[PDB]
Structure 1
Amino acid sequence: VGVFGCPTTVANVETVAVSPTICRRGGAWFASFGRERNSGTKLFNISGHVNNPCTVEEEMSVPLKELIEKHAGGVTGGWDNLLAVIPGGSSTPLIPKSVCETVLMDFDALIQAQTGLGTAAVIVMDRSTDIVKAIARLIEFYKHESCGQCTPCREGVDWMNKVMARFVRGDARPAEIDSLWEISKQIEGHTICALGDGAAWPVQGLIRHFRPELEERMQRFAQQHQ
Structure 2
Amino acid sequence: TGPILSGLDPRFERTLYAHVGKEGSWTLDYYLRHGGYETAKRVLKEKTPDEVIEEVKRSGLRGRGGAGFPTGLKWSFMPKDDGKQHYLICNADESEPGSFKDRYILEDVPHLLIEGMILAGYAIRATVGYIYVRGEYRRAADRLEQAIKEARARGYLGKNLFGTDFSFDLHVHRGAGAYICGEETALMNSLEGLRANPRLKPPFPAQSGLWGKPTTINNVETLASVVPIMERGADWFAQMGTEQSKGMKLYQISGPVKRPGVYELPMGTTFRELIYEWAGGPLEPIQAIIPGGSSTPPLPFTEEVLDTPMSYEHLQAKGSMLGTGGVILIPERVSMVDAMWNLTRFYAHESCGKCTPCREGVAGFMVNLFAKIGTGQGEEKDVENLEALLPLIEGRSFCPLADAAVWPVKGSLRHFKDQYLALAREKRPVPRPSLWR
TM-score normalized by the length of structure 2: 0.48
Q: CA deviation at 1:143?
A: 0.5
Moved beyond 3 Å, runs of 4+? none
Aligned match of 1:139: 344
Mapped partners of 1:20, 1:196: distance in 2 = 35
Bigger helix fraction:
1
1:143-164 Cα distance to aligned partner (Å, 9 max, x none): 1011211311212222111112
Distance in 2 separating the partners of 1:106 and 1:91: 15
Q: Distance in 2 between matches of 1:138 and 1:87?
A: 15
Retained in 1: the 8 A contact 2:241–2:267? yes
**Greater Rg, structure 1 or structure 2?**
2
Say if 1:169 and 1:217, in contact at 8 Å, map to a contact too: no
Q: Whole-Å Cα distance in 2 between the matches of residues 172 and 201 of structure 1? A: 22
Residue 95 of structure 1: aligned partner: 299
Partners of 2:275 and 2:281 within 8 A in 1: yes
**Paired residue for 2:418?**
212
Q: Which residue of the partner structure matches residue 324 of structure 2? A: 119
Where does the alignment leave 5 or more consecutive residues of structure 2 unmatched?
1-207, 429-437
Provide the secondary structure at the position in 1 that maps to 2:393.
coil
Partners of 2:373 and 2:274 lie apart in 1 by 32
Alignment RMSD: 1.8
Q: Distance in 2 between matches of 1:146 and 1:203?
A: 17
1:174 to 377, 380, 388: 380
The C-alpha deviation readout for 1:91-131, integer Å capped at 9, x for no partner, is: 11100012533222101111111221111111001231221
- The percent of aligned pairs where both chains have the same amino acid is 40
Structure 2 residue identity aligned to 1:96: P
Matches of 1:156 and 1:23 in 2, distance apart? 48
Is 1:108 paired with 2:327? Answer: no
How far residue 219 of structure 1 moved from its aligned partner, in angstroms, is 2.6
Aligned residues: 220
What residue in structure 1 maps to residue 269 of structure 2? 62
Aligned-residue offset at 1:170: 4.1
Measure how far apart 1:171 and its partner are: 2.5
Q: Which residue of 1 aligns with 2:120?
A: none
Which residues of 2 match residues 1-226 of structure 1 at below 5 A?
Answer: 1-77=208-284, 81-98=285-302, 100-158=305-363, 159-221=365-427
Could you tell me whether the CA contact under 8 Å between 1:91 and 1:201 is conserved in 2? yes
Deviation at 1:3, TM superposition (A): 2.2
- Per-residue CA deviations over 1:64-101 (Å, capped at 9, x if unaligned) read 11101122211113xxx221000012211100012533
2:347 partner SS: helix
Give the Å deviation of 1:172.
2.3
CA distance in structure 1 between the aligned counterparts of 2:387 and 2:211, rounded to whole angstroms:
39
Question: Structure 1 CA distance, aligned partners of 2:402 and 2:210?
Answer: 23
Distance 1:49 1:168, change over 3 A: farther
Letter of the 2:380 counterpart: P
Contact 1:54 1:71 in 2 (8 A): no
**Which secondary structure does the structure 2 equivalent of 1:23 belong to?**
helix
Post-superposition shift, 1:181?
2.8
Deviation at 1:188, TM superposition (A): 2.4
Counterpart-to-counterpart distance in 2, 1:105 and 1:170? 37
In 2: Cα distance, 1:170 partner to 1:185 partner: 26
CA distance in 2, matches of 1:121, 1:201: 16
Q: Does the CA-based 8 Å contact 1:46-1:121 persist in structure 2?
A: yes
Distance 2:360 2:228 in 1: 44
Q: Distance in 1 between matches of 2:255 and 2:418?
A: 24
**Larger deviation, residues 115-124 vs 126-135:** 126-135
TM-score (normalizing by structure 1)? 0.90
| Separation (CA, whole Å) in 2 of partners of 1:198 and 1:170 | 27
Distance 1:126 1:148 in 2: 32
Q: Distance in 2 between matches of 1:210 and 1:167?
A: 15
